[PDB]
Amino acid sequence: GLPVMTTPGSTQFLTSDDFQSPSAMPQFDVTPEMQIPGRVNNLMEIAEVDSVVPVNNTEDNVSSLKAYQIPVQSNSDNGKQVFGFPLQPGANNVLNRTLLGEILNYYTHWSGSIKLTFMFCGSAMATGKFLLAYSPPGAGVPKNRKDAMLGTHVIWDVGLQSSCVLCVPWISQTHYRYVVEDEYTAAGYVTCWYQTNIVVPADVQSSCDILCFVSACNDFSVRMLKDTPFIR
């Protein structure tokens, strides 16, 4: 008949191929499609919605709803830190189990931006001010309010606005420096500082709380899928 010649790699099962296949049940007339709402075309639509970050882990609030709330009070010390978390990826940071950090653990190299919305869940009469300072990679954690002011900062007025947005980058790879070693200095920090105290009227409670959300600002760029480490 016709002359053919079988090349090497012929009777093999490569588990990542794309060949045709004989259908085990023809003549079936399957049920046609129906307009079901909310169709996912891409996994970068699960990422763009925003979820709440458990900033307040603290070893016994993790089995509670107290892990999500940042405590804020009115103390007698002029200038102090409210919270602060690094941005070193993978190593047990707070953005790991969120709705963004569960997608990006299915990949190995990713690079993009982050929105970080805050929200003051206190009374409608309480007034104050907050510093939202971002330390770029290479610069250390700020220790006073003054040198935290000199970096990148957005000063947040509570009484005028109940929600502040701080957009930072986040990269899978951290460029170390050869001589100076610390667990996370070339990652970043999103620490926050008491600018003024919280001044409140009579018959209003002073101890308020803050929620903190995270999202993806622009589109990411993921590559080389793998399997997640959140399994036995």
Partner: protein
């Protein structure tokens, strides 16, 4: 474009592994087709509520000579039958049974030393989408058990040797592979936190939200 739905789900995964010997008179394999067998593919398919996909299975069958008595155990090539019972079909119980020989259970017959036997199943369901999560009781039944949904029933698979043998016993393993095709997904879902306890249900033990750290600052 590596975050598309097709490039996230159109992969392959060893979902079952069973052995069957040809002489013990209770040796034949059996697998009810689901997705909840392997804990790493179940978690990727439970990010959506409604799915709709074709299926594509490939079987990797081996053999091994069991210790016979004596006197020059020689054997020809072996042939296996891989039957596919549709949802709502007859089911064998013994290795010699009528339900193998029926006409609407499309088998494949395959001899050793060739390419492995791939067959493809379309989207077979009465409804319009498979449902990974179902809040409610068993519809279309007299007694109902919670969260079962008998409408996403995909079939069963049965395997056996079609060679009689008397001299040397032969046992054989099988590794069913699994590959969704032309996947459509609707209504996304948060990703599962706690450990998977059982297969039929979403029962769990409560665990903390994330990993602890020593202070908030």
């Amino acid at each position: 474009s590596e975050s598309s739905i097709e490039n996230f789900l159109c992969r392959s995964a060893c979902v079952y592994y069973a052995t069957y010997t040809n002489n013990s008179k209770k040796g034949f394999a059996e697998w009810v087709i689901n997705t909840r067998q392997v804990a790493q593919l179940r978690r990727k398919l439970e990010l959506f509520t409604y799915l709709r996909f074709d299926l594509e299975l490939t079987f990797v069958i081996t053999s091994a000579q069991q210790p016979s008595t004596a006197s020059s155990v020689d054997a020809p090539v072996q042939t296996h039958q891989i039957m596919y019972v549709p949802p709502g079909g007859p089911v064998p119980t013994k290795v010699k049974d009528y339900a193998w020989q029926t006409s609407t259970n499309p088998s494949v017959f395959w001899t050793e030393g060739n390419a492995p036997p791939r067959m493809s199943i379309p989207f077979i369901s009465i409804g319009n989408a498979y449902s990974c999560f179902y809040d409610g009781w068993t519809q279309f039944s007299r007694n109902g058990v919670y969260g079962i949904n008998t409408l996403n029933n995909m079939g069963t698979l049965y395997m056996r040797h079609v060679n009689e043998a008397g001299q040397g016993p032969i046992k054989s393993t099988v590794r069913i592979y699994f590959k969704p095709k032309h996947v459509k997904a609707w209504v996304p879902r948060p990703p599962r936190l706690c450990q998977y306890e059982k297969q039929k249900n979403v029962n769990f033990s409560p665990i903390g939200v994330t990993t602890s750290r020593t202070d908030i600052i």
